[PDB]
Amino acid sequence: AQSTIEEQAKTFLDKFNHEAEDLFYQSSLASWNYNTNITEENVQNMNNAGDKWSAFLKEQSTLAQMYPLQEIQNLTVKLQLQALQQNGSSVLSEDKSKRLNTILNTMSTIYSTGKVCNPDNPQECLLLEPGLNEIMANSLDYNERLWAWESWRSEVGKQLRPLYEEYVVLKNEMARANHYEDYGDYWRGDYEVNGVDGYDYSRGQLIEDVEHTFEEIKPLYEHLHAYVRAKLMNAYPSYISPIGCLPAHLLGDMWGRFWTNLYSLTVPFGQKPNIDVTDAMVDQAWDAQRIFKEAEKFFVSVGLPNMTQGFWENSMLTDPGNVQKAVCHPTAWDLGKGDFRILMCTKVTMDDFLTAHHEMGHIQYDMAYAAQPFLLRNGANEGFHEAVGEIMSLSAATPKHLKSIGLLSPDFQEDNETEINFLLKQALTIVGTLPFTYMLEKWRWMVFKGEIPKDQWMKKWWEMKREIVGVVEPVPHDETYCDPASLFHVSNDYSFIRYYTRTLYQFQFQEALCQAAKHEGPLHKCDISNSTEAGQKLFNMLRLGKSEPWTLALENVVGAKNMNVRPLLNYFEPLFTWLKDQNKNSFVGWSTDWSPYA
């Protein structure tokens, strides 16, 4: 039966998919030929193909907008129609749209080109990478770190402020014109589900859930913060108050997004040897071939398919040398038409082993939803791909797997102290980033909502810094600065809450798959290898793509319609008890009023 509108939309979607497959394949092939062999011919071909693809997409969008959505009763065609009908930027007038593109490119350029020069030696000038990152990573000098921090900020943020002001105003005009409340509501729209009874999800439910879960995360972070504060007091005597917040420029990176680089300064038991299996790999004369063969064997051992011969034939797995310069950022390419490759300049290190496992998890995700229609070939939401890669890397990092594969000696004794070392190193990275992410996105949401006037942007930014993250600026900043925009994601128009959601999802998935694998010991020692049941349970979710709602896909694996924090707390329980014992005679919490200046 059905209406006459539906059938027309069905025929249109068939024609659109069949026309778009080839254009997307050509554009992706062109971008691959560029990224592995940087020449001018290749960049010109890349830009030509990209402009052709964008023109085709805009033509098909303007055509598809003529089918009235309300009369469609088939959910798949409804999703594809909604995806195609997104106006995007087109609802803006021409002159302001040109100005918006101009300001976007200007911010990106000024970020990617800014240099700060040392006043002591005005001939020496450094950009952010690699100079400022190396200094902020390895320097132990308080004054030098403070100089780097203040020079970078007082240089780039002062320039960035007005561009960001106009960016905010234009983006809010655009978002309101496309029938949204603001640009933050637009961003939160990614999680909306509307139409399936019992699985719906509004855009404010996301805020509610994020706040409810950070409330439960708070105590573990408080204890970790107290421990790190004590260790830093031991590291910089007479500079840190035993009751105050941590100075922002002593956290291990340019912003404090990760406390990873404090492990050398905070290791609980430095007497034990570290489980670095790099030397064993090097002494057995392993190469990239062997590494990827082992990753493939791992993925096949749980019931997932092999890689295609095309992958092994077309991928570039080693540095082509000095004659041919390429981009070495590890990437997983879905070229279309069943062509899958990986571009990564692998070194013979344990980190590259783990990242090979991660990227091959990405590739397996991409392979699993290949039979879906074009516009449905994507993760359930923005957090699923990274969660899958991360659970792969977690399973691969367990010492049991390293022993069973033969790179670690069979007589390696697993004391209770190596486990605490491992859990602390994991916590510095995984839980240290959650308050930062939550606070950054809260500030962005509030700015877009118009709750923070322009004349107190930095005031509210540093108030939130103090209250939530427990971090205080080393020198006072007036409203001329724009310190939030000194981060890449802020100045390049990328959403940020995806990392919070993925951090929760990855431990939900780990709990589900280890319960399925009949694991009995502590969760952090779980290795899902040789569990075809877990493989099947994961594939049942992988195969859906974006055809079904993300709530149903998450329930299919974990049994819950919403994000949960108890998996993370169960992962960190031993470290939690160890900190609770270790902090018996320490102050837990912080006063929001002490400052490194007066």
Partner: antibody
């Protein structure tokens, strides 16, 4: 110009079979849905059957469901209607009409002359 | 199944009279509507195709109106060659259904 033509009308026994053909010319046959419309003698009209563009989804009405089968060969620009288990009530003139395209709300506009299908013992 | 009840069934009028034929749908059928004329022994010829859009080559005395659930065909001034049978047809939802027809006769 579009000049739909029909053939295949004759006399058949009750319970017999018959295959109607409708030859299309003058337009891009492969991009238009086609339909069959009959007229009982001295009565109104009814929608016998309908097909989609790429000869895939075929729709039917409760009266002649499961007895009739519509089909097309886009190569020969020919539309077919296969009718089995005919009964005395199927006596009617049958037309083949053009139908919707892919975007507009246009509908039946070019019809053939018809062919007379009498079912009697 | 949308069920179409046409009123009236028959109708007689003189040349010049204003004639109005109605076709009612039991539910909403959007703007997918069409009116067909049939002379005896000839093929139905389309007059209006989007409930209100006149067909090329059809005199302007024919006009169509209405939407939603109620629809009306109207002839502004009758003509000798206007004596025929008129059918309404909806093609929105499957299956499709015609009206019972309306025969417009001469008054003597």
């Amino acid at each position: 110009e579009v000049q739909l033509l029909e053939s295949g009308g004759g006399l058949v026994q009750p319970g017999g079979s018959l295959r109607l053909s409708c030859a299309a010319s003058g337009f891009t046959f492969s991009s238009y849905a086609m339909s069959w419309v009959r007229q009982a003698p001295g009565k109104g009209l009814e929608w016998v059957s309908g097909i989609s563009g790429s000869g895939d989804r075929t729709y039917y009405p409760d009266s002649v469901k499961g007895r009739f089968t519509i089909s097309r060969d886009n190569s020969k620009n020919t539309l077919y209607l296969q009718m089995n288990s005919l009964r005395a009530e199927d006596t009617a003139v049958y037309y083949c009409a053009k139908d919707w395209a892919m975007v507009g709300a246009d509908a039946f506009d070019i019809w053939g002359q018809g062919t007379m299908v009498t079912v009697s013992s | 199944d949308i069920q179409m009840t046409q009123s009236p069934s028959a109708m007689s009028a003189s040349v010049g009279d204003r004639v109005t034929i109605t076709c009612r749908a039991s539910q909403g059928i959007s703007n997918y509507f069409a009116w067909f004329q049939q002379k005896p022994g000839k093929v139905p010829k389309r007059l209006i195709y989007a409930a209100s859009s006149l067909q090329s080559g059809v005199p302007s005395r024919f006009s169509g109106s209405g939407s939603g659930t109620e629809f009306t065909l109207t002839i502004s001034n009758l003509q000798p060659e206007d004596f025929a049978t008129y059918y309404c047809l909806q093609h929105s939802y499957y299956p499709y259904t015609f009206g019972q027809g309306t025969k417009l006769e001469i008054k003597r």
